[PDB]
Symmetry: C2
């Protein structure tokens, strides 16, 4: 029984960019950024390409799963910064991993990319169409950031996260998932004619808390799980204040809410998978634990996934 | 099972004939026709990819007698997305007024539609979705090198869509098989500028072999012979490749549907557009076994065998 996570990995760019470094780039400050978001630093893929980052996170994940690339049945990569029009970055990565002939493609869902991709993987496993699936969330957001706009350039970072899921016969499994989208709210968060990230910060914040709360409550009810029974909440890392307001609305103690936005900023699709990896490595996740993942992103995509590790 | 209850398309009205092409590049009607089987293609002028996708979807929904808000998921396959984000699937969702509906784009170039249909099938089969809208839409005219005659005579613009649902009858996707091979990126890829580039002769050969193999694979999986297939709906890449495949599978041309002569190669939109026409022309009836297959950039390829 169950879609089970048997391996996780990540790749964090070599270049660190603190708020102090940014102060010299745009009219901003450490105090402002820190208090309004909780971000202290962010990684920048100045040297690495999206493909390279995704491949590294995937390799570590496969090593952890003790699974050969060829044993994969599917590779799903979520990103909003593809290497090229085509082939998909999933294909470029597959090539680097030597996962010959392996089914591969990218998906677009912005910040909701990983949970969308994980939900897809679960559909393939639950339909008996796949057994081993590699799900990657990789982003080189720095290429989509307007570095002259102190309003948005201080929120994003680069990096990649990956997880390997398989069909197990034990109790590990995804208990419930729920994804939503609302294209009529494109304006709140979207790319312009040149691909630059644009947003309506205030409106977005409201919608973010309300929407993630709603879908989180939905998966909990569907799974017949109460908030107090959640072992750990791994939310998209967009703003520490949003995360706090969300935890409050769900009545989940801060101690059970994983946060690492302070060191990576908002990495979109790679956000949750990177947090999951560190959470595991920090001894905060053990088999049997109920993990709640949730996110909201451009296009106004959002959802939640409740699983028993 | 997974049943197609509605289909639809959208094609720009602007026609790019081989004679128009003779006026922009050093090519001829004779060469094009003989080498590709193409005579005409549609080109989007005022339509955005979102508009075309929306029009194809609306027809599919009407055919299915289903309202936009009764959809559980929307999957759109394209290589010419409207913007960085939101996904074109989200933009289409807004135009359809399918409020709150799960939606995303996938990248698999020419195998876009069958990949998306395979995913749709996984959601219905796992019982996670009931009604799914799958779209193949491309405005390839924006990604073509018009200075290049070796490739600018092959592509057109268009959108195709299908609405699949979980039925309590024999309609169902019987078997699917999808593959990808990144090490073969060089045969068919976009350059640093997004322009479509390819190693035509090598891609032609690899295309037939891989497509024959995957087709044979879904057939032995479903327990049926090529002779038992009612209609083959291949990606409309090249009539000559289509003939080579049909020849290998030992399937008469009468059972191979082609409309590349009037729409050219429309990548992800290719199959759903051909399917819709085949249905409208009475070439597809409930119970018929339909084989869909394609190969595209990245070197994606696969096959879907279904009972209409």
């Amino acid at each position: 029984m169950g879609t089970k996570i048997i391996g996780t990995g990540v790749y964090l760019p070599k270049n660190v960019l603190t708020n102090f470094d940014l102060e010299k780039i745009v009219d901003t400050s450490d105090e402002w950024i820190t208090t309004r978001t909780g971000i202290k630093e962010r990684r920048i893929a100045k040297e690495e390409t999206i493909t390279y980052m995704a491949t590294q996170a995937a390799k570590e994940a496969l090593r952890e799963a003790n699974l050969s690339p060829e044993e994969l049945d599917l590779i799903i990569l979520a990103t909003l910064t593809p290497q090229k029009r085509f082939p998909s970055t999933a294909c470029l990565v597959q090539a680097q991993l030597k996962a010959k002939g392996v089914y591969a493609f990218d998906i677009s869902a912005a910040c909701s990319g990983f949970i969308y991709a994980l939900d897809i993987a679960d559909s393939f496993i639950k339909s008996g169409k796949a057994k081993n699936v590699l799900v990657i969330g990789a982003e080189k957001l720095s290429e989509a950031v307007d570095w002259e706009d102190r309003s948005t350039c201080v929120l994003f970072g680069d990096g990649a996260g990956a997880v390997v899921v398989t069909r197990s016969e034990d109790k590990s499994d995804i208990l419930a998932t729920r994804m939503y989208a609302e294209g009529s709210l494109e304006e709140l968060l979207h790319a312009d004619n040149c691909g630059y990230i644009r947003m309506k910060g205030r409106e977005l914040f409201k919608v973010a808390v309300r929407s993630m709360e709603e879908v989180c409550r939905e998966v909990l009810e569907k799974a017949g799980v109460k908030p107090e029974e959640v072992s750990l909440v791994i939310p998209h890392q967009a703003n520490v204040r949003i995360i706090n307001a969300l935890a409050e609305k769900l009545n989940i103690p801060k101690e059970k809410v994983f946060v690492n936005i302070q060191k990576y900023g908002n990495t979109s699709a790679a956000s949750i998978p990177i947090a999951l990896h560190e959470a595991i490595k920090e001894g905060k996740v053990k088999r049997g634990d109920l993990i709640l993942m949730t996110a909201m992103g451009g296009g106004l995509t959002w959802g939640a996934v409740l699983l028993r590790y």
